[PDB]
């Protein structure tokens, strides 16, 4: 029973770290969307200009 208990003890603290970290990462991808639109506009502009 002590063996079972020891696993759970360590988990309880450390999991909270991952919990935060995971959402933090997701936030970064939101910001990446703003980038994506910047990238997009540049690509489009270069293409129209290339045709000219």
């Amino acid at each position: 029973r002590i063996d079972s208990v020891s696993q759970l003890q360590n988990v309880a603290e450390t999991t909270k770290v991952l919990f935060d970290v995971s959402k933090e990462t997701v936030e970064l991808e939101s910001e990446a969307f703003e980038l994506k639109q910047k990238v997009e506009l540049a690509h489009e502009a270069k293409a129209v200009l290339d045709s000219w």
Partner: protein, 85 residues
């Protein structure tokens, strides 16, 4: 998408394994254990608890109380022979 909350919900690992059942047994049993027993019964000096102390110990399988007790009945009826004769 955000990580789900399963890892942090533990309250069904408190009955979830079999030694929880054993635990709730021996947290009572061993806690209510005495260092040594209450007493084994061997003597008490009622003057026949002494008979038990000499003869009817935990380790005495020695035939001596049997012999003594047998001889007692021999002493009983032998006198009764002379009560009837």
């Amino acid at each position: 998408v955000s990580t789900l909350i399963p890892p942090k919900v533990v309250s069904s690992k408190n009955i979830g394994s079999a030694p929880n059942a054993k635990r709730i047994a021996n947290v009572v049993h061993f806690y209510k254990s005495l260092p040594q027993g209450p007493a084994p019964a061997i003597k008490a000096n009622t003057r026949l608890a002494r008979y038990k102390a000499k003869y009817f110990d935990g380790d005495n399988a020695s035939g001596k109380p049997l012999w003594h007790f047998a001889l007692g009945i021999i002493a009983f009826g032998y006198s009764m022979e002379y009560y009837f004769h």
